[PDB]
Design a protein around this ligand. Structure first.
Ligand SMILES: *Cc1c(COP(=O)(O)O)cnc(C)c1O
Ligand SMILES: *Cc1c(COP(=O)(O)O)cnc(C)c1O
Ligand SMILES: [Cl-]
Ligand SMILES: [Cl-]
Lengths: 462, 472
């Protein structure tokens, strides 16, 4: 039997759990609940192997920025695969797709971020960052500058390096992690960690932790601060207005590289080409992936400022991947950016859908179960809480209420994910206002069903 | 901002060096000589932006196994990209391409290798292996088993972990590497490191370093031994006949996982589906990429054995990449595997081209510059030497002669690379006998030119200490 969309879902699910190990999963869970089989997608809508139509408020995995079914990219890939499906960039060799895409990326990246080292993923781009930066500081005559400073509940990939830069304890527990010279300061999540400080003062305190970490560890030991402009996988944590201005102040004062992990935030997600632009900072390096190709072809990379590139360009840089700059991926990514740029999809975000989504998403704070509704551009979160006044957590294991809401969302044909007891959305940037209404309608029904179930099941308390 | 094939080569090269940071390079010597722009390819032939045609004896980067120009992979990618160009396998969700690819890999991987964890590259596959294997020994109640044992001059990728697991000193010197709990033993390269030992004695000694390492580190600390069946990037080092059987028997003595890095050797390269079949080992995990999709789309992974997958299957495995199982990459890899299987390309290697290429390649040992010619399946190397009898290296820094030979190759429209003073080839598996003939004629002319050049440069010499040792 050939394995196609024509096989019964149950049969496909058996083959799935028998041979395909899923990311971030307990694989045995698939014996009880088989994996949902997505077979097609168009616009913002997915269809599963039973014909159900799900609104994908997560855009695949924060990445399908131009939405599904844009055929220009499939035409661009086929044409590239026919002419030159692959050649390497190792042999003093190059091709037009990576040349074109590198010039395009330099143009879009603000300031002197004008050079791209290519990777397959956001994880591999942050491996590049670790190796590039340490080599950079040695080449500058300061090889003791090795420490990357990150944050608890940051997420920077799933390689050995990526997982170590992220701040997920569960990830650190697997692989003898973190790798040496990776440190973590606290995250600017006011709702859960703010105490009774104002958001504004809490944002200052959390930013100041970078200067204290520098002084504690020694400036001669610190290589870089790496951070998501807005934490994505941590639960769409929007920092207070005070946070990034004080980070920038600290980075301006001390000899440290600022690494904006733009893997989720890049390419329109926050209303600008880069989250760095939105929050007002000036990184020396940006990690990119995901929205770079709207997820249609695997590709990521590091955009690097002139000064770092110049110093390393005088050295043999012994790093890189067989698929670095893969011509087809580059051709797909370039068409993605043309479609975002020339159809003004970022304008569509800034002026049309994001203001509408904001008004609707922030009104969910009116729901009894929702203590706060945070959103920038097209990434948003809601904290579910048993007490809005105390901002308290539920008594149950953090994520029990989130999981119930998540299940109610999917059962109501909407892709909204939980991180603990926050729910998160990251819909395609081409989403229209009428589509926002459906999202809000289904999110509200799922939130009501979670409320009643929690009440009935005795889980509404702190 | 319109950059296309129509632009002059000189202009394209200026944009390249200005914005494109090349892997494994000194970016600045692109200011000296700009990059060769490859514009198209078909079969085994590259064309560059000036119309020059190059026989690609390296198959892109050890990966274009079905050769260039297979428009089926484009049709499959396009059709997958219109139907479902991306979905994630993170949300208790899946899709048909990753399901079918996994079932095909489980059927092709011998024995109980029946489970695939997907990556984007061979490097990410090895990051998976480190996190998976350490987590597995911890799940088994033995958390102290963390040390990956690897080899010098091994190559296992370029992530923090891939670079660490490889054995390239220049790679260790960038990133504060190797990361902890990685140990390196010596490599089975008899030509350069054999001393006065016979090859098969040397083979046993080199494999015995694995037990020596295990015993000096402690069985309670060791988690895995990882190794390429045949070292590729280190210069296609074919171990002596004794080497892999002893490794295997050492691994069967100890609680240790054998990981075969099949990123190069996999999918026909050595005359079998996997280099482990050819060298006769039973790995617990195989790392895959390159030939998996014939490089037409980026994808990698780890093929995992039943007992390791099942141990982990009972735990939340907090690992994975957005593009793990990417539906277009899978569809392409599947079609690649279909073509390899249904057109019997491995049979074409085994019975037609590999024996012909072996005959002709090993005859290169008759060349006055060549000291040895080693080939398994469709990967080969030759050692360039000033003295065949002693195997003594050139007096000039290692790679001086290899580099000169590489240049004569590219001047003869042949992609033959050097690793130190070895030349290496890894041609597309669908290479025909007439294409072998062109390869060898070009390779032989490049050997001839190299030979008379270094002779004129006064570089055809071992060290004066090695020349005196010619006193027999
Ligand atoms: C998704 C994520 C990554 C991981 O990139 P992969 O392609 O999954 O390896 C890295 N950084 C950030 C900020 C991410 O959100
Ligand atoms: C090429 C190589 C790798 C790395 O694969 P990438 O796709 O470049 O990350 C790993 N192992 C071996 C043996 C390799 O040759
Ligand atoms: Cl929270
Ligand atoms: Cl040698």
């Amino acid at each position: 039997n050939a394995i196609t969309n024509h096989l019964p879902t149950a049969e496909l699910q058996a083959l799935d759990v028998a041979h395909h190990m899923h990311p971030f999963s307990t694989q045995n869970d698939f014996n009880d609940t088989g994996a949902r089989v997505i077979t097609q997608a168009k616009g913002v809508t997915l269809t599963d192997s039973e014909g159900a139509q799900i609104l994908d408020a997560m855009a695949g995995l924060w990445c399908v920025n131009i939405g599904y079914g844009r055929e220009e990219l499939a035409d661009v890939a086929a044409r590239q695969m026919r002419e030159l499906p692959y050649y390497n960039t190792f042999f003093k060799t190059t091709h037009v797709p990576v040349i074109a895409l590198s010039a395009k990326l330099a143009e879009l990246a603000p300031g002197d971020l004008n050079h791209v080292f290519y990777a397959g993923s956001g994880s591999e781009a942050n491996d590049t960052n670790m190796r590039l930066v340490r080599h950079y500081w040695s080449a500058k005559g300061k090889p003791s500058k090795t420490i990357f400073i990150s944050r608890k509940n940051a997420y920077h990939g799933s390689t050995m390096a990526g997982a170590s830069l992220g701040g997920m304890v569960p990830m650190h527990q697997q692989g003898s992690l973190p790798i040496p010279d990776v440190h973590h300061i606290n995250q600017p999540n006011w709702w859960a960690e703010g105490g009774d400080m104002s958001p504004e003062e809490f944002g200052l305190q959390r930013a100041q932790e970078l200067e204290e970490a520098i002084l504690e560890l020694g400036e001669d030991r610190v290589a870089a601060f790496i951070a998501e402009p807005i934490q994505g996988a941590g639960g769409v944590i929007v920092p207070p207005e005070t946070y990034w201005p004080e980070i920038q102040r600290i980075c301006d004062k001390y000899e440290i590289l600022l690494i904006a992990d733009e893997v989720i935030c890049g390419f329109g997600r926050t209303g600008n080409w880069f989250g760095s632009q939105t929050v007002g900072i000036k990184p020396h390096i940006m990690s990119i992936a995901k929205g770079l190709s709207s997820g249609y072809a695997p590709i990521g990379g590091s955009i690097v400022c002139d000064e770092v590139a110049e110093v390393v360009a005088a050295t043999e840089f012994n790093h890189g991947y067989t698929y670095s700059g893969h011509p087809v991926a580059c051709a797909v990514a370039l068409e993605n950016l043309r479609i975002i740029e020339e159809e003004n999809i970022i304008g569509h975000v800034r002026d049309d859908v994001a203001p509408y989504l904001k008004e609707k998403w922030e009104a969910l704070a009116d729901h009894p179960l929702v203590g706060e509704a945070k959103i920038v551009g097209m990434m948003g979160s809601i904290a579910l809480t048993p007490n809005k006044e105390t901002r308290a957590p539920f008594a149950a294991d953090t994520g029990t209420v989130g999981y119930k809401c998540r299940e109610h969302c999917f059962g109501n044909n909407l892709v909204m994910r939980h991180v603990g007891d926050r729910m998160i959305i990251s819909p395609p940037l081409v989403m229209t206002r009428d589509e926002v209404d459906t999202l809000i309608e289904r999110a509200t029904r799922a939130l009501d069903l979670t409320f009643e179930q929690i009440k009935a099941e005795d889980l509404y308390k702190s």
